[PDB]
């Protein structure tokens, strides 16, 4: 199994104990590390933060401590949107310009591959033709990587993608069988499956449906999404399950109603570290629990929740990560990806469950405890 962990280049701006840099990553923890995010200018890949070059060096320098560790650069993300992707795939010339730039960039800064985080082909402004053009782009990148590997006599660069969990987004976004052929790994975003935008409490990443989930709401769980990808053409072995080291919080309309599907008035408060509206890092959630919140367990969906006064949070813990990992193994998927390494309790001081408690749970469960962690020769 792979254990693939996203690192975010804005975690550096968090105050005090929240500050997270590439050198805070245990190089033995994950099998793959993904750097979020790269940008695009004139159909060519670029940095986005002022100090990305320095951070790349520290990030890829972690491979000097683990001979087996591989790194990838993720281009795009939510705020990036679809416009530069649409423009880049719109002509063969623009795609070639991009692919050439990527090969040069990854080799220069010593990344082992590219993760496409186009959110999403065929939606959020992206026209219908981008569904097929995304397939074309990925195939062309894969084949360019194959050719480059032989010309310079080095291992081939990897091409992966973070992909939609919403069924509508999947249907308008991906030619699954064709796309799966050329991608090395498919990182399925099996989280953000519920949120305050719905007007009621719901879990961030429930494994199974809740009894009341009817119609299209029955699709908002890890099991359905992963199986949808598999049943519609993606090989299980290439499919990577998304694991969140964060939760979504809510403001309860009635503090007396604290169950799944309880009416809410909006997003819960930003945390003191990640400072994200409606989102708490796992370590921020641990503070919530320590400060007197009541623990809940969503039994049908195998995930925890917690509430105090008018604040409700749906999240993942050691128990839920374990259950999901056992499920993953039973279904013979390629492994797990984690958003994000900087949201786990990396210091171990918030949750008192050791360093990186959530990711460590996956490392143990996926048979990676005895994985090689030695500097290269
Ligand atoms: C911060 C923006 N993140 C992304 O675009 C992203 C890219 C790849 C995988 N997961 C992503 N998240 C979507 C937003 N969620 C709140 C966390 C996970």
Substitution site in 313, 339, 341 for ligand 1 pocket (most atoms within 8 Å of beta carbon): 339
Residue nearest to atom 16 of ligand 1 (CA): 192
Q: Which two tokens stand for residue 155?
A: 């291992």
**Resolution value (Å, 1 decimal):** 1.8
- Contact 342 CB / ligand 1 (< 6 Å): no
Query: Are 92 and 135 a contacting pair, CB within 8 Å?
Result: no
In the chain the first and final C-alpha atoms are separated, in Å, by: 25
Beta bridge partners of 303: 298
What atom in ligand 1 is closest to the CA of residue 276? 16
Q: How many CA atoms lie within 13 A of 301 on its CB side?
A: 32
**Cα 188 to middle of ligand 1, angstroms:** 11
What atom in ligand 1 is closest to the CA of residue 115? 8
- Contact 189 CB / ligand 1 (< 6 Å): yes
Taking alpha carbons only, the member of 347, 359, 344, 342 closest to residue 10 is: 342
User: CA separation (Å) from 79 to 12, 76, 306?
Assistant: 18, 8, 29
Residue nearest to atom 6 of ligand 1 (CA): 77
Supply φ then ψ for residue 25, to 5 degrees. Answer: -80, 125
By what technique were these coordinates determined?
A: X-ray
79 belongs to an annotated ligand binding site:
yes
Catalytic residue among 44, 110, 119, 175: 119
Q: What domains are there in the chain, each with its CATH number?
A: 1-244+316-377 (3.20.20.80), 245-315 (3.10.50.10)
Substitution site in 33, 162, 225 for ligand 1 pocket (most atoms within 8 Å of beta carbon): 162
Q: Which two tokens stand for residue 233?
A: 């053409």
**Cα 119 to middle of ligand 1, angstroms:** 9
What atom in ligand 1 is closest to the CA of residue 187? 9
**Cα 6 to middle of ligand 1, angstroms:** 9
108-125 burial, b if ≥16 CB within 10 A, otherwise e? ebebbbbbbbbbbbbbee
Active site residue 140: no
Substitution site in 5, 13, 33, 192 for ligand 1 pocket (most atoms within 8 Å of beta carbon): 192
Helices 92-109 and 52-60: crossing angle in degrees, nearest 10, is: 60
Query: Are 190 and 229 a contacting pair, CB within 8 Å?
Result: no
């Amino acid at each position: 199994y792979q254990l693939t962990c996203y690192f975010t280049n804005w975690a550096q701006y968090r105050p005090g104990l929240g500050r997270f840099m590439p050198d805070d990553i245990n190089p033995c923890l994950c099998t793959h590390l993904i750097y979020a995010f790269a940008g695009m200018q004139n159909n060519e890949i670029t940095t986005i933060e002022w100090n990305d070059v320095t951070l790349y060096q520290a990030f890829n320098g972690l491979k000097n401590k683990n001979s087996q560790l591989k790194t990838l650069l993720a281009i795009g993300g939510w705020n990036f949107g679809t416009a530069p992707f649409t423009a880049m795939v719109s002509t063969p010339e623009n795609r070639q310009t991009f692919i050439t730039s990527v090969i040069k960039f990854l080799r220069q800064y010593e990344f082992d591959g590219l993760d496409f985080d186009w959110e999403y082909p065929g939606s959020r402004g992206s026209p219908p033709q981008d569904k097929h053009l995304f397939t074309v782009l990925v195939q062309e990148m894969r084949e360019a990587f194959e050719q480059e590997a032989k010309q310079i006599n080095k291992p081939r660069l990897m091409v992966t993608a973070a992909v939609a969990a919403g069924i509508s987004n999947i249907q308008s976004g991906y030619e699954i069988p064709q796309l799966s052929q050329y991608l090395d790994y498919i990182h399925v975003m099996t989280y953000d499956l519920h949120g305050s935008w719905e007007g009621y409490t719901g879990e961030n990443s429930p494994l199974y449906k809740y009894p009341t989930d009817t119609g299209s709401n029955a699709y908002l769980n890890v099991d359905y999404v992963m199986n949808y990808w598999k049943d519609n053409g993606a090989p299980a072995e290439k499919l990577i399950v998304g694991f969140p080291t964060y939760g979504h919080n809510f403001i309860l309309s009635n503090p007396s109603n604290t169950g799944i599907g309880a009416p809410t008035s909006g997003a819960g408060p930003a945390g003191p570290y990640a400072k994200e509206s409606g989102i708490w890092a796992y370590y921020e959630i641990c503070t919530f629990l320590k400060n007197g919140a009541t623990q809940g367990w969503d039994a049908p969906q195998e995930v925890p929740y917690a509430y105090q006064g008018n604040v409700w949070v749906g999240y993942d813990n050691v128990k839920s990560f374990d259950i999901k990992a056992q499920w993953l193994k039973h279904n013979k998927f390629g492994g797990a990806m984690v958003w994000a390494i900087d949201l786990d309790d990396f210091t171990g001081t918030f949750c008192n469950q050791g360093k990186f408690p959530l990711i460590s749970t996956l490392k143990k469960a996926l048979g990676l405890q005895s994985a090689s962690c030695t500097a290269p020769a």
